[PDB]
Design a protein around this nucleic acid. Structure first.
Lengths: 94, 70, 97, 134
RNA sequence: AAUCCGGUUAAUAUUCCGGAACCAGAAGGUGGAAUCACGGCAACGUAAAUGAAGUUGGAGACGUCGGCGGGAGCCCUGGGAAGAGUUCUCUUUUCUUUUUAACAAACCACACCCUGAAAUCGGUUUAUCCGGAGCUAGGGUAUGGUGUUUGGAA
């Protein structure tokens, strides 16, 4: 719950991208401090994100809920299997 | 039937042994059609000016059994 | 050929003698499909299986690894999956060593 | 920031798919020719074959001969790897004019092939020169 | 795997005659091409561009129903032309006909790629379907159902 609250605050305070290509671009650029991946993510996509996160030295957070749950927590109406947070802003999620 | 638009290759394919017979057509549009019979394909050429048409009559080899309108 | 069937697919055409005649049109060819995804491949004209022989080698295959048998998206996924699996085997071997 | 010069990566798109390449120069800042995350990468098109001491020297050289390939590809198309290969002859030879001039491109390919053959003779970067099954 | 048109008999025609194509297999020869070819970020493209054993993949090859879109022919019809009518007068009127094959050439539009990161939700079907598993938009790529211009062919 605390992580979800911190993510919600960061969604309006810091910089976040909720998407596969955007997170991959952010991970390649190295700006993405943390990457949140839903449990329902494909094993290949999760492994690719983990390898990119390991190369870029970024935190890897695994959301217990699925993409729908991750989208509901983020407040959007669109499922987001993977999201990348570059700056936490006011929140201290990082 | 390949429509042929290059006079020079029409000349060389006529000299090549595959050519058998040639026909000349004069339509109402004052155009001259050169039809050349080959082994498999009938090559045609459409020219629009008479002086080039006549010049290519005498440029064709005499061995080719050319014929006038049908 | 009495009792017309799916083979006797006739199309009416107007002849130069001002007569209507039926011409038998053969079934259209199907483009090759990707082995993994199952979606048809891109760049292969859809001709008959017998007529495919007459086409040139470059006209039937795409200039890429597994081209003409696996889709490009499938090829990219297969290449990525193999590299990651190889890294996991390398990582597991180092930990086991 | 995971892409640096001299890093070993794999190409996942194009004709040279699944081929290991080394980042000669990074153009991630963008360019007019390639308005994307492009970079100049040199890879191997024909991996060297196994060498047997019983085989003749000419046959061994022919088997070890490798055809290189230099092209600029997008960052998304590439796939970075932990390993990295650095060579003195591969630094400073990458330039816009090199790809612009066809004669320079052939000279660069010849130089890269000569450098790769020397590396194979030295018995270094065996994993990089070895073909990858996919 | 592969054929059309016209003509022809007292009786036979995709078979015969005339003209025009196509398929399969076979060797050499000639010209061209590579020294196991290049280009494009990519989808992929091109006159070519060796591939044994061994290992796979695809076509063949796949139910049924409904609506929509495309094309062809047929039907309808406006003129143009031709002939045959009808016609004291009226009726620019009545009836009939008005062809382009196989095949071969050049060009002519839903799936994917590139830039892109979107909800203030957009695009859109006759029928609301898709979109951070990446929308609309821009640029491409391929598939050409077809259509254009011919050749055939007057």
């Amino acid at each position: 719950d605390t992580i979800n609250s911190k993510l919600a605050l960061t969604m309006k305070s810091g910089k976040y991208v909720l998407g596969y290509k955007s997170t991959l671009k952010t991970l390649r650029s190295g700006k993405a401090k943390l990457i949140l991946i839903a449990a329902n993510a494909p094993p290949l996509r999760k492994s690719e994100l983990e390898y990119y996160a390991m190369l870029s030295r970024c935190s890897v957070h695994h959301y217990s809920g699925n993409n729908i749950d991750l989208g509901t927590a983020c407040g959007k109406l669109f499922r987001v299997g993977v999201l990348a947070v570059i700056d936490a802003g006011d929140s201290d999620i990082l | 039937p390949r429509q042929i638009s290059d006079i020079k290759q029409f000349l060389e394919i006529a000299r090549r042994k595959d050519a058998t017979s040639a026909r000349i057509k004069k339509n109402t549009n004052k155009d001259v059609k050169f039809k050349l019979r080959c082994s498999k394909y009938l090559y045609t050429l459409v020219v629009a000016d008479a002086k080039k048409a006549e010049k290519l009559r005498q440029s064709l080899p005499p061995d080719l059994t050319v014929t006038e309108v049908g | 050929l009495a009792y017309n069937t799916r083979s006797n697919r006739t199309r009416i055409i107007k002849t130069p003698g001002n007569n209507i005649r039926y011409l038998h049109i053969k079934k259209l060819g199907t483009i090759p499909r990707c082995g993994d995804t199952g979606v048809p491949l891109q760049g292969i004209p859809a001709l008959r299986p017998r007529e495919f022989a007459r086409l040139s080698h470059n006209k039937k295959t795409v200039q890429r690894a597994y081209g003409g048998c696996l889709s490009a998206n499938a090829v990219k996924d297969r290449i990525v999956r193999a590299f990651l699996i190889e890294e996991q085997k390398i990582v597991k071997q180092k930990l086991k060593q | 920031k995971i892409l640096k010069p001299g890093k070993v990566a794999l190409i996942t798109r194009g004709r040279f798919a699944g081929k290991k390449v080394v980042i000669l120069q990074a153009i991630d800042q963008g360019s007019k020719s390639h308005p994307f995350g492009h970079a100049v990468v040199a890879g191997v098109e024909r991996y060297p074959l196994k060498v047997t001491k019983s085989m003749g020297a000419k046959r061994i050289a022919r088997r070890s001969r490798v055809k290189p390939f230099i092209k600029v590809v997008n960052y998304n198309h590439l796939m970075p790897t932990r390993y990295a290969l650095e060579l003195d002859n591969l630094k400073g030879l990458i330039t816009a004019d090199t790809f612009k001039e066809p004669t320079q491109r052939s000279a660069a390919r010849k130089t890269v092939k000569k450098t790769f053959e020397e590396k194979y003779q030295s018995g270094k970067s065996a994993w990089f020169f070895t073909p990858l099954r996919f």
